[PDB]
């Protein structure tokens, strides 16, 4: 595909605590919207992401598509329960290389909305923020809990229509699906602690084998010791490298999945505060303007040619929003076969961790099994 990156050097800016590490990026990508083929960029992350954040509003005030997170940092010690960091230290770096190839693949998705090119030369270039990325503004998303009371006494209004009569299913069943995939999710990553214990009890079972193997002299069974406490070593390591990588890594898929429900939600919930909106403007018009039209016998003909302005003009801009939410209704099923097709992605991901899973452990062990039945013809 056009898109050949490359992301290497996790290039620390000192001591602290989730903060900030720069990122050595090399992008060879064709398309020549991209500018020379050459490219190498550094850039620190938990300072784009407030570019995806206006992002974020941006596409809530046009109805534009944002591409998988560029995650960001503080998120160690705060607001994750819980992350460490050593597992962090190149590995959850490389967590932030696919979210950010996922970034990368679907803001290719939106060629047009691609073609914004102040975003792009944005990520191409170096104009890095200052460190000030770590701060609490959220009194929009508080606005929106104090608006909420007004949803729950507007949501029939809104159910009376006729395209959530084609979304509503969805709806259901992606509240089904997120139910079972937080109890999945949860599963997962007690499946997660549970390896490392289990690694550790065969571990120690290996170095017991080495402690009870002394004071005998029955050296196959010395042979015996020094062949399976590798062997149990290479069991250890093929288990516990799929057991973790791949199943937090699902993880991570299924919570920024959850993350797109949840800002989907918050897109059709500003179609929702949109709706109510030319709902009273055209309650309000029919009536303060017929309010003023009644009022023609007073003799000022000055106030029918205002008042005729009004109903024709906002009657206009009224039916040209309604319409235009058939619009972004129609971009958002756009939207909506798009994310089933990365549905069609992130579980042909599965599929290619099961096609790498038979791979790696047929090869691996059963080349372990051929390369160690003919030492064990009779030697052990």
């Not at 490359?6 to 090399?26: C, F, L, Q, R, S």
């Not at 792009?120 to 770590?134: C, M």
């Not at 170095?207 to 005998?216: F, Q």
């Not at 062990?365 to 039945?373: C, R, S, T, V």
Request: hydrophobic share 40%.
């Amino acid at each position: 595909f056009d898109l050949t990156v490359g992301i290497t050097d996790p290039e620390k800016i000192g001591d602290g605590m989730n903060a900030y590490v720069a990122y050595k990026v090399t992008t060879q990508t064709s398309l020549p919207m991209f500018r020379s083929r050459q490219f190498a960029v550094k850039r620190r992350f938990s300072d784009f992401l407030g570019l995806y954040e206006k992002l974020s509003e941006k596409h809530s005030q046009n109805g534009f598509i944002v591409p998988p997170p560029p995650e960001k940092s503080l998120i160690g010690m705060t607001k994750v329960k819980v992350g460490k960091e050593d597992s962090s230290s190149a590995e959850f770096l490389e967590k932030r290389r696919a979210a950010l190839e996922r970034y990368l693949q679907r803001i290719v998705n939106h060629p047009t909305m691609l073609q914004d090119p102040d975003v792009r030369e944005f990520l191409e270039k170096e104009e890095l923020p200052r460190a000030v990325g770590t701060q609490a503004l959220s009194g929009a998303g508080l606005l929106k809990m104090f608006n909420k009371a007004t949803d729950a006494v507007s949501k029939m209004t809104i159910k009376m229509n006729e395209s959530d009569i084609w979304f509503e299913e969805k709806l259901q069943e992606v509240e089904c699906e997120e139910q079972r995939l937080r109890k999945l999710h949860a599963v997962v990553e007690t499946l997660v602690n549970h390896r490392k214990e289990l690694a550790l009890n065969t571990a120690l079972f290996a170095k017991s084998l080495a402690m009870l193997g002394s004071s005998e002299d029955n050296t196959a069974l010395s042979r015996a010791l020094s062949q399976l406490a590798e062997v149990e070593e290479k069991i250890e390591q093929l288990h516990q490298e799929q057991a973790n990588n791949d199943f937090f890594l699902l993880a991570e898929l299924l919570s920024d999945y959850i993350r797109l429900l949840a800002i989907v939600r918050a897109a059709f919930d500003q179609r929702m505060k949109t709706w109510q909106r030319w709902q009273d403007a055209q309650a309000t018009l029919q009536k303060k303007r017929e309010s003023e039209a009644r009022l023609l016998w007073a003799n000022k003909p000055d106030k029918l040619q205002q008042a005729k302005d009004e109903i024709t003009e906002w009657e206009s801009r009224v039916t040209q929003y309604e319409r235009d939410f058939e619009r972004i209704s129609t971009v958002v099923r756009k939207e909506v076969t798009r994310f089933e097709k990365e549905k069609s992605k992130d579980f042909k991901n599965h599929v290619m961790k099961y096609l790498e899973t038979l791979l790696h452990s047929q090869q691996q062990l059963a080349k372990y099994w051929e390369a160690f039945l003919p030492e064990a013809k009779a030697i052990s």
